[PDB]
Protein backbone atom coordinates (compact mmCIF):
# COMPACT_ATOMS: atom_id res chain seq x y z
CA UNK A 1 0.00 0.00 0.00
CA UNK A 2 1.12 3.57 -0.70
CA UNK A 3 -1.19 4.92 2.02
CA UNK A 4 0.73 3.08 4.72
CA UNK A 5 4.01 4.60 3.56
CA UNK A 6 2.91 8.24 3.70
CA UNK A 7 4.25 10.38 6.52
CA UNK A 8 1.91 12.58 8.55
CA UNK A 9 2.82 15.72 6.60
CA UNK A 10 2.66 13.72 3.35
CA UNK A 11 -0.77 12.51 4.42
CA UNK A 12 -2.00 16.06 5.05
CA UNK A 13 -0.58 17.27 1.74
CA UNK A 14 -2.22 14.44 -0.21
CA UNK A 15 -5.58 15.13 1.43
CA UNK A 16 -5.30 18.88 0.89
CA UNK A 17 -4.26 18.41 -2.74
CA UNK A 18 -7.29 16.20 -3.31
CA UNK A 19 -9.83 18.76 -2.07
CA UNK A 20 -12.86 19.14 -4.29
CA UNK A 21 -13.64 22.67 -5.48
CA UNK A 22 -16.42 24.81 -4.09
CA UNK A 23 -19.18 24.72 -6.67
CA UNK A 24 -21.71 27.47 -7.29
CA UNK A 25 -25.48 27.05 -7.31
CA UNK A 26 -27.77 27.74 -10.27
CA UNK A 27 -29.39 30.14 -7.80
CA UNK A 28 -31.02 33.30 -9.12
CA UNK A 29 -31.75 35.82 -6.33
CA UNK A 30 -34.46 37.48 -8.45
CA UNK A 31 -37.09 34.73 -8.47
CA UNK A 32 -37.69 34.15 -4.70
CA UNK A 33 -38.21 30.76 -3.08
CA UNK A 34 -40.62 27.86 -3.38
CA UNK A 35 -40.22 24.39 -1.88
CA UNK A 36 -39.71 22.97 -5.37
CA UNK A 37 -37.03 25.51 -6.31
CA UNK A 38 -34.90 25.28 -3.17
CA UNK A 39 -35.07 21.49 -3.25
CA UNK A 40 -34.04 21.79 -6.87
CA UNK A 41 -31.11 24.02 -5.93
CA UNK A 42 -29.96 21.81 -3.06
CA UNK A 43 -30.27 18.53 -4.96
CA UNK A 44 -28.84 20.01 -8.19
CA UNK A 45 -25.86 21.20 -6.15
CA UNK A 46 -25.46 17.86 -4.38
CA UNK A 47 -25.60 16.02 -7.70
CA UNK A 48 -22.72 18.12 -9.04
CA UNK A 49 -20.77 17.79 -5.79
CA UNK A 50 -21.28 14.02 -5.90
CA UNK A 51 -19.31 13.76 -9.13
CA UNK A 52 -16.43 15.65 -7.53
CA UNK A 53 -16.72 13.64 -4.33
CA UNK A 54 -16.40 10.38 -6.26
CA UNK A 55 -13.24 11.57 -7.95
CA UNK A 56 -12.00 12.91 -4.62
CA UNK A 57 -12.49 9.51 -2.93
CA UNK A 58 -10.15 7.91 -5.50
CA UNK A 59 -7.45 10.31 -4.27
CA UNK A 60 -8.00 9.40 -0.61
CA UNK A 61 -5.00 7.23 0.37
CA UNK A 62 -5.84 3.53 0.65
CA UNK A 63 -9.23 3.91 -1.02
CA UNK A 64 -7.91 2.84 -4.44
CA UNK A 65 -6.53 -0.34 -2.83
CA UNK A 66 -10.06 -1.51 -2.07
CA UNK A 67 -12.15 -3.68 -4.37
CA UNK A 68 -14.61 -1.78 -6.54
CA UNK A 69 -17.50 -3.35 -4.66
CA UNK A 70 -16.11 -1.99 -1.38
CA UNK A 71 -15.63 1.47 -2.89
CA UNK A 72 -19.24 1.59 -4.04
CA UNK A 73 -20.42 0.53 -0.60
CA UNK A 74 -18.34 3.09 1.31
CA UNK A 75 -19.44 5.99 -0.88
CA UNK A 76 -23.07 4.78 -0.84
CA UNK A 77 -22.83 4.77 2.95
CA UNK A 78 -20.98 8.03 3.46
CA UNK A 79 -22.01 10.32 0.62
CA UNK A 80 -24.41 12.55 2.57
CA UNK A 81 -22.20 12.68 5.68
CA UNK A 82 -19.39 13.83 3.42
CA UNK A 83 -21.62 16.43 1.73
CA UNK A 84 -22.73 17.60 5.17
CA UNK A 85 -19.31 17.91 6.82
CA UNK A 86 -18.14 19.85 3.76
CA UNK A 87 -21.12 22.15 4.08
CA UNK A 88 -20.51 22.68 7.79
CA UNK A 89 -16.84 23.39 7.10
CA UNK A 90 -17.73 26.01 4.47
CA UNK A 91 -20.21 27.68 6.79
CA UNK A 92 -17.88 27.81 9.78
CA UNK A 93 -17.10 31.52 9.36
CA UNK A 94 -20.72 32.41 8.59
CA UNK A 95 -22.54 32.28 11.95
CA UNK A 96 -26.22 31.45 11.64
CA UNK A 97 -25.85 30.61 7.96
CA UNK A 98 -25.19 27.58 5.77
CA UNK A 99 -22.92 28.32 2.80
CA UNK A 100 -24.11 25.69 0.33
CA UNK A 101 -22.33 27.63 -2.38
CA UNK A 102 -20.63 31.06 -2.43
CA UNK A 103 -23.80 32.40 -4.06
CA UNK A 104 -26.17 30.34 -1.91
CA UNK A 105 -25.85 31.35 1.75
CA UNK A 106 -28.89 30.31 3.80
CA UNK A 107 -30.01 30.83 7.38
CA UNK A 108 -32.65 28.69 9.07
CA UNK A 109 -35.78 30.67 8.12
CA UNK A 110 -35.20 29.82 4.44
CA UNK A 111 -34.98 26.18 5.49
CA UNK A 112 -38.66 26.49 6.34
CA UNK A 113 -39.39 26.72 2.61
CA UNK A 114 -39.11 22.93 2.62
CA UNK A 115 -41.04 20.76 5.09
CA UNK A 116 -38.91 19.42 7.93
CA UNK A 117 -35.73 20.83 6.41
CA UNK A 118 -35.40 23.40 9.18
CA UNK A 119 -34.69 20.58 11.65
CA UNK A 120 -31.77 19.52 9.45
CA UNK A 121 -30.54 23.11 8.95
CA UNK A 122 -30.53 23.61 12.72
CA UNK A 123 -28.38 20.53 13.26
CA UNK A 124 -25.95 21.58 10.54
CA UNK A 125 -25.76 25.07 12.04
CA UNK A 126 -25.11 23.63 15.51
CA UNK A 127 -22.30 21.55 13.98
CA UNK A 128 -20.80 24.62 12.32
CA UNK A 129 -21.06 26.44 15.64
CA UNK A 130 -19.20 23.50 17.17
CA UNK A 131 -16.38 23.68 14.61
CA UNK A 132 -16.15 27.44 15.16
CA UNK A 133 -16.01 26.86 18.92
CA UNK A 134 -13.14 24.38 18.47
CA UNK A 135 -11.28 26.51 15.92
CA UNK A 136 -11.22 23.52 13.56
CA UNK A 137 -8.31 23.61 11.11
CA UNK A 138 -8.47 22.66 7.44
CA UNK A 139 -5.79 20.04 8.06
CA UNK A 140 -8.11 18.48 10.64
CA UNK A 141 -11.18 18.82 8.43
CA UNK A 142 -9.68 16.81 5.57
CA UNK A 143 -8.64 14.11 8.03
CA UNK A 144 -12.19 13.87 9.42
CA UNK A 145 -13.76 13.74 5.97
CA UNK A 146 -11.56 10.82 4.89
CA UNK A 147 -12.29 9.04 8.17
CA UNK A 148 -16.00 9.30 7.34
CA UNK A 149 -15.43 7.85 3.87
CA UNK A 150 -13.56 4.85 5.24
CA UNK A 151 -15.42 4.41 8.52
CA UNK A 152 -19.13 4.79 7.92
CA UNK A 153 -19.70 1.65 5.86
CA UNK A 154 -16.89 -0.47 7.26
CA UNK A 155 -19.28 -2.20 9.68
CA UNK A 156 -21.84 -3.01 6.98
CA UNK A 157 -19.61 -4.91 4.53
CA UNK A 158 -8.47 -8.53 5.23
CA UNK A 159 -10.23 -5.80 3.26
CA UNK A 160 -11.46 -4.21 6.49
CA UNK A 161 -8.08 -4.80 8.13
CA UNK A 162 -6.55 -2.63 5.44
CA UNK A 163 -9.17 0.07 6.02
CA UNK A 164 -8.59 0.00 9.77
CA UNK A 165 -4.87 0.38 9.10
CA UNK A 166 -5.49 3.49 7.01
CA UNK A 167 -7.94 4.80 9.61
CA UNK A 168 -5.16 4.34 12.19
CA UNK A 169 -2.76 6.26 9.94
CA UNK A 170 -5.21 9.16 9.82
CA UNK A 171 -5.42 9.05 13.61
CA UNK A 172 -1.62 9.30 13.68
CA UNK A 173 -2.01 12.27 11.35
CA UNK A 174 -4.54 14.15 13.49
CA UNK A 175 -2.27 13.68 16.51
CA UNK A 176 0.83 14.87 14.66
CA UNK A 177 -1.07 18.02 13.68
CA UNK A 178 -2.20 18.76 17.24
CA UNK A 179 1.32 18.21 18.57
CA UNK A 180 2.47 20.79 16.03
CA UNK A 181 -0.20 23.22 17.23
CA UNK A 182 1.48 23.14 20.65
CA UNK A 183 -1.10 20.98 22.38
CA UNK A 184 -0.13 18.89 25.40
CA UNK A 185 -0.50 15.11 25.33
CA UNK A 186 -3.75 15.39 27.29
CA UNK A 187 -5.04 18.18 25.05
CA UNK A 188 -4.25 16.06 22.00
CA UNK A 189 -6.39 13.16 23.22
CA UNK A 190 -9.17 15.49 24.31
CA UNK A 191 -9.33 17.29 20.97
CA UNK A 192 -9.06 13.97 19.14
CA UNK A 193 -12.08 12.63 21.02
CA UNK A 194 -13.95 15.91 20.52
CA UNK A 195 -13.40 15.71 16.75
CA UNK A 196 -14.50 12.07 16.48
CA UNK A 197 -17.56 12.61 18.66
CA UNK A 198 -18.74 15.16 16.11
CA UNK A 199 -18.82 12.33 13.54
CA UNK A 200 -21.58 10.73 15.57
CA UNK A 201 -23.77 13.77 15.10
CA UNK A 202 -22.78 13.96 11.45
CA UNK A 203 -24.00 10.38 11.05
CA UNK A 204 -27.22 11.41 12.78
CA UNK A 205 -27.79 14.32 10.44
CA UNK A 206 -27.11 12.13 7.41
CA UNK A 207 -29.58 9.56 8.71
CA UNK A 208 -32.28 12.19 9.16
CA UNK A 209 -31.42 13.88 5.87
CA UNK A 210 -31.65 10.57 4.02
CA UNK A 211 -35.14 10.01 5.44
CA UNK A 212 -36.15 13.55 4.54
CA UNK A 213 -34.75 13.06 1.04
CA UNK A 214 -36.64 9.77 0.65
CA UNK A 215 -39.90 11.43 1.68
CA UNK A 216 -39.37 14.24 -0.85
CA UNK A 217 -38.79 11.63 -3.56
CA UNK A 218 -42.14 10.03 -2.74
CA UNK A 219 -43.65 13.50 -2.44
CA UNK A 220 -42.49 14.08 -6.03
CA UNK A 221 -42.22 17.87 -6.00
CA UNK A 222 -38.91 18.06 -7.87
CA UNK A 223 -37.05 15.55 -10.11
CA UNK A 224 -34.10 14.02 -8.27
CA UNK A 225 -31.13 13.18 -10.50
CA UNK A 226 -30.44 9.56 -11.46
CA UNK A 227 -27.27 9.39 -9.37
CA UNK A 228 -28.97 10.87 -6.31
CA UNK A 229 -31.89 8.45 -6.66
CA UNK A 230 -29.46 5.53 -6.82
CA UNK A 231 -27.52 6.72 -3.76
CA UNK A 232 -30.81 7.27 -1.97
CA UNK A 233 -32.01 3.78 -2.85
CA UNK A 234 -28.70 2.37 -1.60
CA UNK A 235 -29.92 3.19 1.91
CA UNK A 236 -32.99 1.01 1.43
Amino acid sequence: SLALSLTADQMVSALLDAEPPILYSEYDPTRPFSEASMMGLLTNLADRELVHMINWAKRVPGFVDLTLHDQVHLLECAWLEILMIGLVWRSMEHPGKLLFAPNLLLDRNQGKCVEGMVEIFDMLLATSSRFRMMNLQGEEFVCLKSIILLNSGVYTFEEKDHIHRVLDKITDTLIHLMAKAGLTLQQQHQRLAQLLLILSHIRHMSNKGMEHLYSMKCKNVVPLSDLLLEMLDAHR
Binding site: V51, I54, N55, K58, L68, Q71, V72, L75, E76, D226, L227, E230, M231
Partner: peptide, 9 residues
Protein backbone atom coordinates in the same frame (compact mmCIF):
# COMPACT_ATOMS: atom_id res chain seq x y z
CA UNK B 1 -25.01 1.54 -11.41
CA UNK B 2 -23.84 5.10 -12.05
CA UNK B 3 -21.52 5.23 -9.02
CA UNK B 4 -19.91 1.99 -10.20
CA UNK B 5 -19.34 3.47 -13.67
CA UNK B 6 -17.97 6.76 -12.33
CA UNK B 7 -15.66 4.83 -10.01
CA UNK B 8 -14.41 2.74 -12.95
CA UNK B 9 -13.25 5.47 -15.35
Amino acid sequence: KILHRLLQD
